[PDB]
Amino acid sequence: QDWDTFQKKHLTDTKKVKCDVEMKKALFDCKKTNTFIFARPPRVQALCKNIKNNTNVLSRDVFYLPQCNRKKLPCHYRLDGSTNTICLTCMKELPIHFAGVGKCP
DNA sequence: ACGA
């Protein structure tokens, strides 16, 4: 929605995310899936430099993407992972949505 | 400090 929420929902400083601890947060509310990006804010923010507002951009570089996937109700997950390019939605040169991976929508 |  916004840059602050994007960082909380999609950035991680660790590869081993504690899915069951984080996903129960109102931020995630035990949703089906959430993908994190292993990167510091500055590197991710740079991807939106020069990008038109409310449009998507695909990174040239790859990132490691820890992913929490709901396995058992109501809030139990399995940690998965993959590496790929990321597609972000930009607004005022700041990421506001994690649009897709490997390619933009 | 072993972490795609």
- Give the number of domains in chain A: 1
Estimate in Å the CA A16 to C1' B3 gap, whole number.
8
Which structure tokens are listed for A53?
């507002």
- Of the candidates A6, A10, A37, A89, the residue annotated as catalytic is A10
CATH number at residue A64: 3.10.130.10
Place of tokens 């570089």: A61
* CA A51/CA A5 separation, integer angstroms: 19
A16 touches strand B (CB under 7 A): yes
Q: Which nucleotide is nearest to A15 (CA to C1')?
A: B3
Range of the domain at A47: 2-105
Catalytic residue check, A97: yes
Cited resolution, angstroms: 1.7
Q: Which two tokens stand for residue A43?
A: 């590197």
Among candidates A63, A68, A9, which has minimal Cα distance to A38?
A63
